[PDB]
């Protein structure tokens, strides 16, 4: 009775925003600099902020003769979501403000284009038959780990003009093997042609991706029998490894955004 009346002593005592969340961060990667804090309220380029005094780090003003909003030389300076504006001779970062100016550790001002590719297989278990995940089906991706890093970054990056293969799945990876998957990349669905949330962005420069995906339905096909056992996978790097695509991949968060919309095209579990 003591225990229950102790349950009656207490019984009568009963009466966000979706903006770029990676560029607007302190400590611009690999540089002892800071960004002027830009809260979510004043991120757009029309909100009036007059205390604005951001730094100008770039790893001035005669930058004319730059064909913005068009294909400036062999660079294609026009972003996917329409033309941008120019505040003298430097472009203005769309999608909001960052807190820094200049270019940072980037090639050139404007839309920097990379071509992060997606290569997938349903993970084999013991028989070939895909083993059911928690609810829906489960896939894998091929990720690469260069030594001086802490995440299993996707195998792709800066597209050298006329390469069509993103300079990293072209080097320190499969080599003397290009013609085949360079004849396969013109076959597949696009999942994201747009802007990334890199921590390396600035108010006068940004990076963009085209994201192609290729899937291998079988396990002993003529594609998985010539992709895996034809790759050098080590020129000066330190790793290559197929990884299970879960909610907490040790991948770069920006790339995990891509997977969160790419694995969803088949009914997977990210």
């Amino acid at each position: 009775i003591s225990n229950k009346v102790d349950a009656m002593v207490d019984l009568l005592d009963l009466d966000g925003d979706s903006y770029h969340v990676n560029a607007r961060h302190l400590l611009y990667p690999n540089c002892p600099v800071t960004r002027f804090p830009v809260p979510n309220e004043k991120v757009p380029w029309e909100t009036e902020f007059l205390i604005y005094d951001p730094p100008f780090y770039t790893a001035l003003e005669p930058l004319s003769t730059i064909q913005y909003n068009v294909v400036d030389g062999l660079r294609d300076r026009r972003s996917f979501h329409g033309p941008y504006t120019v505040q003298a001779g430097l472009p203005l970062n769309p999608m909001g403000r960052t807190g820094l100016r200049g270019r940072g550790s980037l090639s050139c001002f404007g839309p920097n284009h990379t071509l992060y590719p997606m290569v997938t297989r349903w993970r084999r278990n013991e028989d070939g038959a895909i083993c059911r995940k928690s609810i829906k089906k489960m896939l894998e991706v091929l990720v690469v780990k260069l030594p001086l890093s802490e995440h299993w970054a996707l195998p792709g990056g800066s597209r050298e003009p006329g390469e069509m293969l993103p300079r990293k799945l072209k080097r320190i990876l499969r080599q003397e093997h290009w013609p085949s998957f360079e004849n396969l990349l013109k076959c597949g669905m696009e999942v994201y042609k747009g802007y990334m949330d890199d921590p390396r962005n600035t108010d006068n420069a940004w990076i963009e991706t085209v994201a192609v995906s290729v899937h291998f339905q079988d396990q002993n096909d003529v594609e998985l029998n010539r992709l895996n056992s034809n790759l050098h996978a080590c020129d000066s790097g330190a790793s290559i490894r197929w990884q299970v695509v879960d909610r907490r991949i040790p991948l770069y968060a920006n790339h995990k955004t891509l997977l969160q919309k790419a694995a969803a095209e088949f009914g997977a579990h990210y």
């Binding site: 925003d17 969340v21 961060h25 804090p37 809260p39 979510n40 309220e41 205390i51 928690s134 907490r248």
Partner: protein, 465 residues
């Protein structure tokens, strides 16, 4: 003598200023501003804090003893702001005589303004001595005889003059800024100090804070400035990571050292204290109802990140912050809002210590409340991370919590994975956790293999005859 590795980071500050502070002139310091190279030649036209902060080896590495307040030995080092957290982990481990920690309670807060409530003053030490009682916890706090740092050193004395183990084994690391120490003279001897002296006078400090008197080891950082607090903030945030994430090596790959950050009240340097920690990945708990910056992030910690604006921070900085409010300009409230928003959308690294009819217990259940919401997002990419979750969850015997957090998930019932947790619940008593495993139906008959009895039999109670 590991002095050929650590450095001054002392500054060749050419005299190019006059601020008229404490009846003096010039830039921070005096005729001791010219160490050996002097303000000479042409080095210096505008005092860039990056061009020339030349790094010479230390001169403050010894053992400090107070006058009569504590007849003991305390070892201190004058480290720089750029020394890696591996010249020093190789130095506390084996150059000092310290073990490998298992829990890293970080107790930060306010300074030189602190009136701990007579009842909160009681929940604090009943909450902070018990974590020290068990495991091998390290207490890393700022080194000063003021603030929550003077209350965390005010309970270790109670737990060293009357305790279970008597004597004392707590390892209360004190890390502060060298420049913000009152009588730095006599603490600077070439080679070592070897029982040097530190007189505790708190009347002539003016603005230069004295050290505490109940910590264990003092790690003084240096940047070459006088009166600039806040220098000791970034370095400990890699200290508390490299110690707590890449120092242990069973499991063949890696295991995370538990780390928690407790904050009571606060100030300008307390928000940069928790933002850097949460960004790094240190779970933190805020004690609501205390006062300053703890509270202003105690009642905004559940609202949407979009709701938090300059207007809300203006209204919520005019109640907890009374006399400092008029000091707050329009360039310190739009720089205080972005950091608050930043620590808010890390909702998986921040909790709150509810006061009245909620969280009616010591600070301790709150530290694993922070860990629980933190590691719920971290429950599968760590794999073994469940095992240490329970190795702390035995500290409160959170039978109801362990039932609530796992047994009503979409739990795969994982009979094999329940066995490392079974053994973790066997190494000491845990009377109810093992029965929890038997309604789950841990089949003992295959759980006990030959190596299982091995593991059980090396872990007898050491106190038994």
């Amino acid at each position: 003598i590991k002095k050929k590795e650590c450095v001054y980071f002392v500054e060749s500050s050419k005299l190019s200023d006059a601020g008229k502070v404490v009846c003096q002139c010039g830039y921070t310091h005096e005729q001791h501003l010219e160490e050996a190279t002097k303000p000479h030649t042409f080095q210096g036209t505008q005092w860039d804090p990056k061009k020339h902060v030349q790094e010479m080896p230390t001169d403050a590495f010894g053992d400090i003893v107070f006058t009569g307040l504590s007849q003991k030995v305390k070892k201190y080092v004058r480290v720089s702001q750029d020394t890696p957290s591996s010249v020093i982990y190789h130095l506390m481990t084996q150059h000092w005589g310290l073990d490998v920690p298992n829990l890293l309670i970080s107790v930060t807060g306010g300074a030189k303004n602190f009136n701990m409530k007579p009842r909160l003053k009681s929940i604090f030490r009943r909450g902070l001595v018990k974590v020290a009682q068990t495991t091998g916890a390290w207490i890393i706090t700022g080194g000063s005889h003021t603030g929550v740092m003077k209350q965390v050193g005010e309970a270790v004395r109670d737990f060293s003059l009357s305790s279970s183990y008597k004597e004392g084994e707590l390892i209360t690391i004190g890390v502060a800024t060298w420049g913000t120490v009152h009588r730095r003279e006599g603490l600077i001897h070439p080679t070592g100090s070897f029982p040097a002296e530190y007189i505790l006078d708190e009347d002539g400090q003016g603005n230069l804070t004295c050290l505490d008197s109940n910590h264990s080891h003092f790690i003084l950082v240096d940047d070459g400035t006088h009166g600039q607090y806040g220098v000791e903030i970034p370095l400990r945030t890699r200290l508390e990571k490299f110690i707590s994430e890449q120092t242990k090596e069973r499991g063949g790959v890696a295991i995370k050292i538990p780390i928690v950050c407790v904050v009571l009240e606060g100030g300008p340097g307390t928000l940069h204290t928790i933002d850097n920690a949460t960004t790094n990945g240190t779970p933190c708990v805020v004690v609501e109802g205390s006062g300053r910056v703890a509270d202003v992030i105690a009642q905004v910690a559940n609202l949407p990140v979009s709701d938090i604006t300059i207007s809300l921070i203006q209204q919520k900085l005019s109640v907890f912050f009374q006399e400092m409010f008029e000091t707050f300009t329009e360039s310190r409230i739009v720089e205080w809002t972005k950091k608050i928003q930043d620590i808010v959308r890390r909702r998986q690294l921040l909790t709150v210590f509810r006061e009245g009819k909620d969280g009616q217990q010591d600070v301790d259940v709150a530290i694993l409340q922070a860990l629980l919401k933190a590691s719920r997002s971290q429950d599968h990419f760590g794999h073994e991370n469940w095992d240490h979750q329970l190795k702390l969850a035995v500290a409160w015997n959170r039978v109801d919590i362990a039932r609530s957090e796992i047994f009503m998930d979409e739990w795969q019932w994982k009979p094999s994975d329940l066995h490392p947790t079974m053994t973790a619940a066997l190494i000491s008593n845990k009377p109810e956790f093992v029965k929890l495993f038997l309604e789950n139906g841990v089949q003992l008959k295959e759980f006990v293999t030959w190596d299982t009895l091995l593991y059980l039999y090396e872990n007898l109670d050491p106190s038994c005859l």
